[PDB]
Write a protein that binds this DNA or RNA. Structure first.
Lengths: 132, 63, 378
RNA sequence: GACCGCAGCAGGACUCCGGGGUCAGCAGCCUCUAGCGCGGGAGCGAACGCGGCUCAGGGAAGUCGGCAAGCCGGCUCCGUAACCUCGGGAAAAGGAGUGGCUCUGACGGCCCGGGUCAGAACUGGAACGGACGCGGGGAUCCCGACUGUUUACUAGAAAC
RNA sequence: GAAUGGACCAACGAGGAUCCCACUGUCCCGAGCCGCGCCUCCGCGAGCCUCCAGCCUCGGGAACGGGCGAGGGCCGGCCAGC
RNA sequence: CUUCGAUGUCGGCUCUUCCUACCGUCCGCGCGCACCGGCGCGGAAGCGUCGGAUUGUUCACCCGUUCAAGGGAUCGUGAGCUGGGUUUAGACCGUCGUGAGACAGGUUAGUUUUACCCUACUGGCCCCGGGGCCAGAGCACGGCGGGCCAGUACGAGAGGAACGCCCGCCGCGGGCCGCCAGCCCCGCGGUUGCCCGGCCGGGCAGCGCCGCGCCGCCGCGCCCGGGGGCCCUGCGCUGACCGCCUCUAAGCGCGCACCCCGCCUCGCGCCCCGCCCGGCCGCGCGCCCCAGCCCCGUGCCCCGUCGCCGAGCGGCCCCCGCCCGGGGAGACCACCCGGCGCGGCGCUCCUGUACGGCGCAGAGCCCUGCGAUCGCCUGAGGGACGCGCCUGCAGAGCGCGG
């Protein structure tokens, strides 16, 4: 929803990001990023607020694993620069499983969630406890 | 201008300078410099580094 | 066969040949379109890069997420010691192309401009415009020559000299630029306007206005002989490779039997004339004003000078122009600023909430010596 | 330091005597004695090489293959699985401690010796095998039981 | 396919495979920094190669020319790379 | 047909160009095209054609995504690399052979030689003022979404456009360092072994290790990238031959991500001015039009062959230093700047509170002794390559050439 200002992409493909929702998945492996055109040799990259195609890790509930699932990264360890000049980074890299339509697969989003993720996806914004 | 202070150093971060960390406790930790941040990430105590206002408070030099 | 996977060329062939700029300073080359209907205006002005800074801004860009929101941007201060006109050059439009039709020099040429003429002033004989000063002085000769320009010239230019005494650098010899005169109803009016400016100072405030966008021209920062990986952008090859990985692997096919000019080769990177474009003029002011860069929110006098001085540059005593972002060149390098040839249509309006006079030497937290003195007090 | 390889050839030559400190050490790292300053020097501090470091966030997605590098490691103390020819596996895995000072117990001989092992306090930017030395680990599959041996100079193997 | 030995793996192995945890410039995507070469000087100074000559496009030709036919470029003298 | 007194051989990596027999983007046009989407053509080679799992793979295949055409360059690309494939000598296994041995059958282990030459390329040079100008040469923005438009045209509904403008984004390109990461030349603090008798202050362990760190460089950061001309395929206009008809046969308008120019990178040369301002040469002007051709069909015909006066136009020539020292510049040079620099003092910044003195600090031990440490003098001291200044020494060759 809206237009996303470019933010530094800290999570390449092959990254494992934590789950911030009570879906029953603990670790999400980034298979790919939505809306990526490629250049020869360039792995797909992703940042806060970007939909990523993930697969649930073996630690996750059996129903969730063995299938590609869409999710949005909400926390990124790499620091990024907002237009106002704020440089912000998070303690961990985390994601919430969400359908491309925007339905969250989880009742609650635990922990802090980035402002950019919250503006782009409306359901994440209501659910998130804090938008720091 | 609008100003914030380091969560560790306690010196006014000027606008456009500094890094903000969002902790898992949902607390924003604003850091003036990389040094302000590195001391916190090594959990080295704020009250044992003299330049910090926390140690200035403990000495009672600036409180 | 074929490249198999499609990948673009690395580098712009337009910017070849990548040689150190033989021209001394960035040249204006082409000048803005005349228009033929505006208040007569000079189109360019030389500057010395002083430094870069942070500017808090309020954005009025409708349709953008930044609408009604604050922003911080890189600024680039270009020191602008006031220039003085020393001559007027007229150019006929000939079938071959613009060709000069004689120049009329000032009756009195300043020592900085004369210093440019010689390699060593002290050991030279100062024999410049010696018989010219006698031919003029009365000034009847100057008017007669100006009249020849009025009939034989279609493009009028003003020669101008920077005074480097009022600039922190050690150049001492002046820099001469032909600044075009544009917009007047007719050539006779243009040379009349030029005579009024003759032997008198021109300031950036007159040439460029806040909110306009200017094109900055200068020689780039020089890195010396560089490798293909730094110079053209190629990949560092696998780290299991003998004889090095910092080299383009294959420089051509069997046929053509010769290395093509397209292929990336190692050479000089840096010191290249480059023109940047449409950098908005955030603020034109003089450092003499104590409150020159003050804004309502800071409540401090706030002159342009950072605490501790600009880094690799000095006093910036006189007027300055601030441009959005960056201009080509290192600090202490001449940069020709020219009115934009193709300005960006949807540029926001510039309203600066805050400017940073915090020391750029090191990391600064105090924006005035008094402010740092107050903190350290005892 | 003169032998033998065409050389004043980072090549190869058998013995004997072997101090101090840190240490389990004849290890590494500095040193006493004794030797000694090696087919030359100056500048500059490009590319590129050759050795060496560091790198945000991710982490093998790189590659024919995790090649190379990185991790691990000393000591003490817990805690150790399947499997097994019952010997092993096993240092399995997986952890916790470690510095300096100030003490307090143990241990002999007949007031005189050892300096190792425990147990404390107290202190230090949240540090201690602070250099150095010094396994990454697990789950399998195929061959060959094993320690051995092998194409001087492209195969060290499942071959002998 | 059964001492041209079959099946069988405890323990081994600079043996040959597959995967996982860890770890990292292997890579995304490269960047900076040391030393030593390089480079310039002073003094020493070879080897190897060598019909001649050392720019191209096309054509014809032992069918893939520096030289030949037809064009199109080109002062000459050197350096560092490649 | 050429190559065996040898042209290293597959695929990758890397990089560059080329082709169109076009996948999407661009322009028209036809549908068994209402919309959406498909499909077929003609022009079109600017841009994109990616990330990965098995395999040496090319291929093949599958998973993803802005959903992804095919090919040429000695089957482009080994003094570029790799050695995975292959393809010697070691070794098994299966089959075949009495055997030595074979395999168009599998399996493992197996050196990657040399550029200092010449060309080509990439930069650099071969003393000559300041500003400029233009021959030639290079060339660079494209795609993808969102907000409106609008749930509107369109359709019975399901579905579902568009132009325009406005915002982003990805790729690419050229820069830059204010932030924010990275990085440290000799800064400050910690610490291990040894050595300088201890304290202090040092060395050595080829920067012992470590934590920060400025100037600088850098990317992960940031700035920047809005245009004209003729026209293609064709769509139309007046309009015939061929009383009609007709985009065409004259004539005429529109018009492509292509093309060419612009802007941009270079630039031989030339121009103007300065100092000068002096020489050398040559003597020669209507315009248009060809289905009015307005009087045609001539003329010159002698650059020495006697023309060389002058004037007038037009040409042409002639000028224009280094060494040395810094640097924003650098292999060397060149470039840019110059009475520099040295070392002080302020300012600012880096690190983190200097030695020493003091205390009823101090766990305790023991005699006024011992003690790791802690507090005060002290946001101290130490350092600086950034700034401002001279307050001190200095600093502009009758050196060389013109």
């Amino acid at each position: 929803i809206g237009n996303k200002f470019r933010i530094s992409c800290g999570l390449p493909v092959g990254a494992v990001i934590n789950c911030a929702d009570n879906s029953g998945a603990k670790s999400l492996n980034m298979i790919a990023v939505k809306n990526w055109k490629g250049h020869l040799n360039r792995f797909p990259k992703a940042s806060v607020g970007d939909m990523v195609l993930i697969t649930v890790g073996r630690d996750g509930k059996p129903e969730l694993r063995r299938k590609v699932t869409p999710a949005v990264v909400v926390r990124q360890r790499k620091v990024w620069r907002r237009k106002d000049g704020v440089w912000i980074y998070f303690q961990d890299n985390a994601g919430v499983i969400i359908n491309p339509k925007g339905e969250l697969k989880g009742s609650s989003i635990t922990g802090p969630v980035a402002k950019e993720a919250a503006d782009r996806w409306p359901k994440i914004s209501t659910t998130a406890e804090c938008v720091h | 201008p609008r100003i914030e202070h380091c969560s560790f150093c306690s010196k006014p971060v000027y606008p456009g300078k500094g890094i903000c960390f969002v902790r898992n406790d949902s607390r924003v930790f604003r850091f003036c410099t990389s040094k302000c941040h590195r001391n916190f990430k090594m959990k080295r105590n704020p009250r044992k580094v003299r330049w910090t206002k926390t140690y200035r408070l403990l000495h009672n030099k600036d409180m | 066969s074929h490249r198999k996977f499609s990948c673009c060329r690395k580098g712009n062939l337009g910017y070849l040949p990548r040689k150190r700029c033989t021209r001394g300073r960035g040249r204006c080359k082409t000048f803005p379109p005349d228009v033929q209907g505006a208040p007569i205006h000079l189109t360019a002005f030389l500057g010395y890069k002083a430094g870069c800074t942070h500017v808090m801004r309020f954005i009025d860009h409708r349709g953008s997420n930044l609408h009604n929101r604050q922003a911080i941007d890189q600024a680039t201060i270009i020191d602008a010691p006031p220039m003085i006109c020393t001559a007027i050059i007229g150019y006929a439009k000939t079938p071959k192309g613009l060709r000069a039709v004689t120049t009329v020099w000032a009756a009195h040429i300043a020592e900085p401009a004369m210093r440019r003429f010689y390699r060593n002033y002290f050991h030279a004989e100062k024999t410049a415009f010696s018989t010219y000063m006698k031919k003029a002085a009365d000034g009847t000769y100057i008017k007669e020559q100006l009249g020849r320009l009025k009939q034989h010239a279609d493009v009028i230019r003003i020669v101008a000299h920077t005074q480097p005494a009022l600039t922190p650098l050690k150049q001492k010899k002046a820099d001469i630029m032909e600044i075009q005169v544009n917009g007047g109803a007719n050539v006779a009016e243009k040379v009349d306007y030029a005579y009024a400016l003759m032997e008198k100072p021109i300031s950036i405030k007159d040439v460029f206005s806040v909110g306009a966008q200017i094109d900055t021209i200068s020689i780039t920062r020089g890195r010396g002989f560089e490798g293909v990986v730094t110079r053209w952008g190629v990949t560092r090859l696998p780290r299991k490779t003998r004889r090095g990985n910092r080299k383009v692997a294959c420089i051509g096919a069997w046929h053509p039997a010769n290395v093509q000019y397209t292929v990336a080769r190692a050479g000089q990177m840096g010191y290249f004339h480059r023109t940047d474009t449409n950098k908005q003029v955030f603020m034109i002011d003089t450092a003499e004003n104590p409150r020159c860069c003050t804004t309502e929110f800071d409540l401090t006098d706030k002159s342009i000078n950072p605490v501790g001085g600009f880094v690799n540059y000095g006093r910036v005593q006189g007027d300055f122009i601030m441009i959005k972002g960056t201009c080509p060149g290192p600090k202490r390098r001449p940069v020709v600023m020219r009115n934009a040839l193709l300005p960006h249509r949807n540029c926001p309006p510039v309203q600066l909430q805050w400017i940073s006079t915090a020391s750029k030497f090191g990391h600064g937290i105090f924006e005035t010596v008094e402010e740092r003195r107050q903190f350290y007090a005892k």
